[PDB]
Design a protein around this nucleic acid. Structure first.
Length: 70
RNA sequence: GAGCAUUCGCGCAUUACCAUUCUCCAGAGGAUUUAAAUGCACAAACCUAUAUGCCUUUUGGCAUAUGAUUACACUUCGUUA
């Protein structure tokens, strides 16, 4: 609590002290899943969208950990 | 039958990002999402199924008359100052 409010720790810029993003929330995961199902249905497996989405899925991602319940 | 000649038309096809790890994982299951009538309801032509008045009720029951009789009117294409 003192680290949050009393000592001066969050006083630098944004480019310093920035964090990796939190992982995508479940609504956005469901939206992306629906988009991928749409793409594989009406555009095909061998499309640029499907292959690019798979290629972006295979690469690792730098994330944080959720601390709260939301 | 040439032509995306024309239409803020219709249907189909197509559009590529390159990291960098603090995301719980693996299975089981078939919901959600997307796609489209050969499904549903009708519509349009096409084919099939006597007159007066009473009651009608998506339609027939009742008297009369050309009437118990093998018989009878009509679709005429015209054009030559």
């Amino acid at each position: 609590q003192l680290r949050e409010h009393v000592e001066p720790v969050g006083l630098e810029g944004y480019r310093a002290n920035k964090q990796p993003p939190l992982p995508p929330r479940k609504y956005f995961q469901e939206q992306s899943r629906r988009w991928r199902a749409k793409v594989l249905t009406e555009r095909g497996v061998f499309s640029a969208d499907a292959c690019r989405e798979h290629a972006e899925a295979i690469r690792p991602k730098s994330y944080r950990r959720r601390t709260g319940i939301r």
